[PDB]
Amino acid sequence: NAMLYPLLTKTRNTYDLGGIWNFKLGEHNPNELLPSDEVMVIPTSFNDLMVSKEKRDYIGDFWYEKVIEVPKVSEDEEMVLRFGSVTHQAKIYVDGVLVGEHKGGFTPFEVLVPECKYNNEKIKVSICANNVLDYTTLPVGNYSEIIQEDGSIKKKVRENFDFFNYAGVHRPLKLMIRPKNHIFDITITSRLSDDLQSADLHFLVETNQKVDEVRISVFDEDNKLVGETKDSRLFLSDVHLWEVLNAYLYTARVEIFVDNQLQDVYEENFGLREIEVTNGQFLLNRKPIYFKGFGKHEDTFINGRGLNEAANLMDLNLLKDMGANSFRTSHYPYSEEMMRLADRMGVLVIDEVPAVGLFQNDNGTWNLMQTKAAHEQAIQELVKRDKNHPSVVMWVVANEPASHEAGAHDYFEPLVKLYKDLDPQKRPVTLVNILMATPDRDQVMDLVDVVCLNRYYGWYVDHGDLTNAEVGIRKELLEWQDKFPDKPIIITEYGADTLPGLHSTWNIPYTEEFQCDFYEMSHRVFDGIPNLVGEQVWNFADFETNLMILRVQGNHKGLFSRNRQPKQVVKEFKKRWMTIPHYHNKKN
Template sequence: MLKPRSTPTRELVNLDGVWRFAIDSRVGDRPWTALLDTPLEAAVPASYNDLFVDAEIRDHVGWVYYQRSVRVPRGWANERILLRFDAATHAAKVYVNDDLVGEHIGGYTPFDIDLTDTISAGEEFRLTVAVSGDLTNETIPPGKIEVGMDGRKKQVYFHDFYNYAGLARSVWLHSEPLSRVTDVTVVTGFEGATGSVDYRVETDGTGEVAVRLSDAAGVVVAQGSGPRGTLEVADVTLWKPGAAYLYELTVELHDAGSVVDSYPVAVGVRTVEVRGHEFLINGQPFYFTGFGKHEDTAVRGKGHDNAFLVHDFQLLEWAGANSFRTSHYPYAEEVLDFADRHGIVVIDETAAVGLNMGVVGGMSGTPPFPTFSEQYAGAATQAAHAQHIRELITRDKNHPSVVMWCIANEPASNEEGALEYFTPLVELARELDPTRPLTYALVMFATFQNDKIVDLFDVVSMNRYYGWYITPGDLTTAEQYLQGDIQGWVDRTGKPIIMSEYGADTQPGVHSVWDQPWTEEYQASFLEMYHRVFDRFPQFVGEQVWNFADFATSNGIHRVEGNKKGVFTRDRKPKAAAWALRKRWRGLEGRKPGSDGE
């Protein structure tokens, strides 16, 4: 699905702002058929949970309603008219005036609704969007809804970040020509100094496809025609980590001598490959340094914010990080666009977090019932998971910053049924994109001895917390556990290994001369121990600390104002560990694979 853009043949109107807002228990039946009877207004984009001081709204289970009026530009006659939602967490029903015009399930990927036959240019209409944050065993991520003794519904979920809901990303009204480009797929490569851009264009309507590739200065360097082909780029400038270079592929649809549609795609020429125990970008070994992140800020929840986007990338650069993982869901497209432009490497992850009943069993890892069963992750869950993979790869396939797909975080890959559950999903991901490696993030319970699915994947991504959840405060014993764990995966797989999560909760301002958990000194010592172990293994290709910044979680008593494993506070102040990481990662430049000159 192409992101709406303003081009010579397309226009868009941003619908962000303040919308009327109500929860379903406070409005009558069919509230979309009139103005919402509510005193409340909610910001878009933003999660609604933290906007209000009303606990009933924050903890609401069920549907909420957003509403505003929209006027279609007069000049859009004889155009296709569409509504675009960059995300609605986790399900949406969209009404124009009194009528349901579209639905979508999945909280972190976009969807379009075609209004061409519903409204007309110059017309004003009432737009109502019903959004549900409910999670069940048939959603991704999964969860369950319980009813308490007082009759209230309560959302239970099996992941450790707050279940923010609402319209957390932008909403657009946009136009497209009646004959139009509907999709573009780009695959790049190079041989010596000559780059290649394989393209495939899908269209609807009549017309002939023509393409041209321009360099960063706007000079056309290659041209082609037809719905698919290969463009050669002499003296190509490659897209590299830390040194982004983008070409622009302009795709046009010509009919009767006129351009009836035009759409631009940013292109970074680069290759990605796993060879033995190495992860290669442009044929050179690459070493990941960075974080697992979250889309999480005060008041906005998961609402996209460009100010935080810019500042977070500044902090990544300050720390010497070259990468991050979109834990645990696809991030806003603006984030990937920014990474493309600034040379930050991305591991792009689906929203499949919480597929693990062992987590419910606590650190024993003993599930109350099998994860991969109709009680929990059954056929319906698998189908929803497949749809998430389709929508993620369809949306993000052309981003040069995206070098690997992560199709699940901490699934119960040690349980029976895991292989049968994941095999068709891996096959689907490889069919959709055969060019990028695949991984999943290993939970602590999944060891090199009992994991059942690692052979399906290209890279071993480990989430490990020795020294925190296991042997807390005892880094000497934790180091022995970590050393043996990594060695086991090296011996079993021979594949590249990345530590996709490791970290310790830290309350800023708490200090101790001893290895005392929750202190800033302990967090720094914890990371130092892990790094000492990493450096013993040539098979190790990266380290992504959990987490970039503190973030909101559920109301569990083991959390105080959320998860405090961030090396930055939630408002982006550095803890001692941030300075320690800056020293290490900037010191790795020129020594670890993937740095300039190697």
């Protein structure tokens, strides 16, 4: 139900509830008042703000609590709490009463404040967050309980993924006063003309109640009126297209009317562009694109997975300065803020649900992977939240699932359909593939539009041995190309752990020089694979992980450090990506 970015309009009062909240790890009676012994900030991951390991590794319930003043709410209005997200599960209390609930740590939801409380001076909001991951959650966790002889129970999650399980309220929480009868959803659809110069627009507006009139006023980047309709249909002559690294955004002001008066007004941006996949190519505006960019993480010192709009912008500025043009939201939906920024900057985005960890670890006879419900929900929420973004060019169903094992096809078949059935634009959906699932073994890739591969020849296979890595990477890309002559291929991950300061004359893995050598070898291969249409390094920047022997205080495959300072290899990518055009047809 929370699919619309919270805006301030003359009919919608939006209040930011961020700041300091009373805070507690562990159990709490929401009928009672949390002390100010512990506090926590909203938004931010809580983990790094803890000074001890035991606290940073806490798993279970933890609470945020604040007494909040009730604004003026008129008879025809209602009041909702709107969360960008709570990680991973959340129960929301008003005055000690359970009033809403959510599962999924990376998508927004709203919670209605009971009408009977609108004439009160104050309300106490209590948020019971929970950071347990399961075989029933996304991402997938290995959950276990050990009794302490205390004998309290210690909960722990052995992540089935390579990123630290940051938890907390990572995204802005809003107190939202809006009309009872309001605009629930807006879907924007366009059919571009033969020559790509005009657009037949369809604005599909959802309401809960009867409306007399629905006026839509479209404005261009100069805020000049260029179209108006009362029937949901608009024809725009001589449009400006949304082009890679050269964005053009229209904004659709939607006003609804009952009995000759404004009931609700919302402003939704859209961009005009066409996506197609054919002949081993990714077409944007009917021209062949070459992806260059990064797998990313929402990760930063101090804030962990919490939203930092300034990091979004610093990254995006660097991306574009490098000559890059895209990135993937690995391994979970990013914040709305980041999406709106990619739109504004013309950056291509591969948008993914948190389906990472779908891989067991004899044996497995019993049904342990109960992920289907969460998966279906994740897909619905992402498409409903993100479908209007011109920057979203493709969906990902999973990252590195066990796609070579029996039962894989039948799990993904309906989920891929779901993206198609839900996306008005029917964008391509992909599946990101692990090295184990080789062309012969894999049994899922027939279902998808674009082949995405994470490959580390010269790092995990043939470690530090480029001569043989080259033969391996080339061999496999040729098998993929052959098995699917039709589909485009995108390297969604490739890189090499690199610690700033480590140096060698002898191409030594972990040194800055080896990072350069690794990418040279990789690009020499890619450039000779006709159906390979894009390359996205892992990772943009170094990032936090859990304790595992092959992680040297986090992942270090970043071109930048966690503090966003460049490694040696950045100069090299800048020379390469400024030489390859965005609209680059190889083939030729």
